[PDB]
């Protein structure tokens, strides 16, 4: 026993405001990541090595954006296989950046806390472990994107979306997203930094401040989106009952904060241009 709330769309907000932001983000991210990859790959430290991986992870997202922008403007003309490919690439590039940030935090912990015998595990870890710990789990976490991401036709409109049997997998995968992207890497990063600051209280800062700024910017671009996801999931569980206009308000704010969070693929070349590398 529950009445339905249907989503609302208007030509002015979606079809004009979102394509422009997507285009600006696309041009900025593609130029920045192309320049960074060209300079790094074809002329270092270890943070630069991890930032090259971050740039490569950002390129996939930037590539993915010309599809969402076109879908927002006109339609989805690209078929069914490309729908799955876009979803899989988006999920991989989403999950493979926070893990690299956690690896950067671990590298800083090893470099600063020990500083006596760490070049060997730092090498081993960087070369051998990043491939088996960042990309492989990210690829494995995209099975639901392989299965449930399909294109469906209604009248003359094709939509690319994740179609689940009922509204509980949405909650399950939103909680999985929050847990994977925000908590465990967050715990690792904040514990490495707590132990570093505890170690350096009685006491290098040119790279530590840069890494701290990068991590803070990345985790501050995604926080409103995670708050919106949490509120939406607490509405789907029927723990928050505040009418039907509240749901539309939170959906609009989730859209806006997602557009804001799509700016994470430009931070790396901005901290490269401004801070001077």
């Amino acid at each position: 026993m529950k009445e339905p709330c249907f989503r609302e769309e208007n030509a002015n907000f979606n079809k004009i405001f979102l394509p422009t932001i997507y285009s600006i983000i696309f041009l900025t991210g593609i130029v920045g990541n192309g320049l960074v990859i060209l300079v790094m790959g074809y002329q270092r430290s270890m943070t630069d090595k991890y930032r090259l991986h971050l740039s490569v992870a950002d390129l996939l997202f930037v590539i993915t954006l010309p599809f969402w922008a076109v879908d927002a403007v006109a339609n989805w003309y690209f078929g069914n296989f490309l729908c799955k490919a876009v979803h899989v690439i988006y999920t991989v590039s989403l999950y493979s950046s926070v893990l690299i940030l956690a690896f950067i935090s671990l590298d800083r912990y090893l470099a600063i806390v020990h500083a006596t015998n760490s070049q060997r595990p730092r090498k081993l870890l960087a070369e051998k472990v990043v491939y088996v710990g960042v990309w492989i789990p990210a690829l494995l976490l995209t099975i639901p994107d392989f299965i449930f991401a399909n294109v469906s036709e209604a009248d003359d409109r094709y939509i690319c979306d994740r179609f689940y049997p009922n509204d509980l997998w949405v909650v399950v995968f939103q909680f999985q997203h929050i847990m994977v992207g925000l908590i465990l890497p967050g715990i690792v990063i904040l514990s490495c930094y707590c132990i570093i600051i505890s170690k350096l209280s009685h006491s290098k800062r040119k790279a530590l401040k840069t890494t701290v700024i990068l991590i803070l910017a990345f985790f501050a671009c995604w926080l409103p989106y995670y708050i919106g996801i949490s509120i939406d999931s607490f509405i789907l569980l029927e723990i928050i009952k505040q009418g039907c206009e509240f749901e539309n308000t939170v959906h609009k704010w989730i859209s806006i904060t997602e557009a804001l969070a799509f700016f994470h693929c430009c931070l790396n070349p901005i901290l490269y241009a401004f801070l001077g590398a």
Partner: antibody
Amino acid sequence: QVQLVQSGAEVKKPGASVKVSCKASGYTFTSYGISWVRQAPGQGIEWMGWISTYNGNRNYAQKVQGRVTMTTDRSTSTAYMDLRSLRSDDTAVYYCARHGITGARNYYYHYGMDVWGQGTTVTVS
Amino acid sequence: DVVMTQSPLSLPVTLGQPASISCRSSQSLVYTDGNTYLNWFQQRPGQSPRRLIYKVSNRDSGVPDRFSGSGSGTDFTLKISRVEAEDVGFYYCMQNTHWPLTFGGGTKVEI
């Protein structure tokens, strides 16, 4: 092929109950919603209700509210409609249509009515 | 909520000559995204309704080129450029912009 198959014609006494089914095939059952409509002999087509096969959200018309209930079955991909406290005015032909679309980020109601059932004649005497 | 008025009640037409059925709504059938969702249904005797045209003037798959639709705002029209022996039946116009959907009165095309 996309199709919906209903049950047979049936005759009921006044005050009885009618449970009519609608089985969908040829498409993903949970990506759309099911709308139940009726047409009386010598009268226009009148909307009766809508049920979402995705999350079980339903809405009945004000005229028929209080006597109609709708349920779904994902395992057998079918939708039911139960009408109770029948009167002689309920003698009509009931149709089942695919109405609306309900996905993770899309939950609209202005798409559909593409495919319909063959309709069942309910005679109340 | 939204009433739809159809004209004429009965439309006797001759073979090879055009036919026009016009229906008008109580309110403006323009959605918040700028699209109008009014569609036309044809019902033969003993069969479920079959669409012809959707979104004011967009034809389905399998309908002939004779059928066409026009009008915008609160007045919409269906036209058959050449009436054939298989066009006999009932014609309805339905709007799907406001919850809930409503049907037209229905017009009987008599050969």
